[PDB]
Paper text:
Subsequently, the TxDE(D175A) mutant, which is catalytically active, was crystallized. Its structure was determined in substrate-free form at 1.6 Å and in a binary complex with the substrate toxoflavin at 2.0 Å resolution, by molecular replacement with the refined structure of TxDE(F94S) as a search model. The structural features described in the present study are based on the structural analysis of TxDE(D175A). TxDE encodes 221 residues, but a total of 222 residues from Thr-2 to the extraneous leucine and glutamine at the C-terminus form 14 β-strands and three α-helices in the substrate-free form. The metal binding site is embedded in the hydrophobic cavity in the B-domain, which was generated by a deep, concave, funnel-like surface enclosed by the hydrophobic residues. Although the top and bottom of the funnel are mostly closed off, there is a vent on the side of the funnel that connects the surface of the molecule to the inside of the enzyme. The metal binding site is located at the end of the 9 Å-long hydrophobic channel from the vent. In the metal binding site, three residues from the inner wall of the funnel (His-60 from β5, Glu-113 from β8, and Glu-138 from β9) as well as three well-ordered water molecules coordinate with the bound metal. These six ligands form a coordination shell of octahedral geometry, with an average distance of 2.2 Å to the bound metal. In this coordination shell, His-60 and Glu-138 form part of the equatorial plane with two water molecules, each across from His-60 and Glu-138, respectively, while Glu-113 and a water molecule trans to Glu-113 serve as the axial ligand.
An enzyme that showed the ability to degrade toxoflavin in vitro was recently identified from Paenibacillus polymyxa JH2 and was named toxoflavin-degrading enzyme (TxDE). Structural and functional analyses indicate that the enzyme is similar to a dioxygenase in both its structure and function, and that toxoflavin degradation is catalyzed in an oxygen-, DTT-, and Mn(II)-dependent manner. The topology of TxDE is composed mainly of two layers of β-sheets, which bisect the molecule into A- and B-domains, each with seven β-strands. The location of the active site in TxDE was suggested by the presence of a possible metal binding site in the B-domain, consistent with the requirement of a Mn(II) ion for its catalytic activity.
Numbering used by the authors: 2 to 223
Amino acid sequence: ASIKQLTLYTAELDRMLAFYTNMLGAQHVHEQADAFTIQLGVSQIQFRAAADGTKPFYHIAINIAANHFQEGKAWLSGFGELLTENDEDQAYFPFFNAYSCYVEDPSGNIIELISRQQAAPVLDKPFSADQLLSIGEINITTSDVEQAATRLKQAELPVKLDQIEPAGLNFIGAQDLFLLLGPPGRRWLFSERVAVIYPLQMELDNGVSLAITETGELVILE
Ligand SMILES: [Mn+2]
């Protein structure tokens, strides 16, 4: 499956709108009162105003073509200093056979471009914002990992309950989309920030809709 719509919160609505408009172009953004949406290929993200006293952020990876990694990395570096880990400004993940690069947006969201070497198409054309393919990862940071995994299995997602680690990160998915299911607490790779529970809502290709409440419970909406 793929993510049709992801709803996230932000305490920096105005700066976020300016950042994404400059990055993707007005044609890929739609401003509303107290919220705006951005189009990322077949996926859309709607950023809504956060509650005062909160500064939500998330880890979002965006799929790009198998052959577009260096162009993607160059393009991303135009919007912010590339984040680094172990002093390197990119990573290779053998589990996903993918190359990744990162930048922070105005809210501190960890924005990753992930180029899956065998699980993404080869696009014989120049890379551009119009070549972002879909959302490839989103963190599902929950107060109950076991309960959450059990419910995602119903949402029809591939889940091997016997391998679910309640105190760690769990890669739930296949092909080009993986939900990063885990508890709050640990520092995210490439970031100074640690995983913390913030609300979000997600609508999948299969008509399944879910939400993470402000206390971290994963709930199937439809
Ligand atoms: Mn990632």
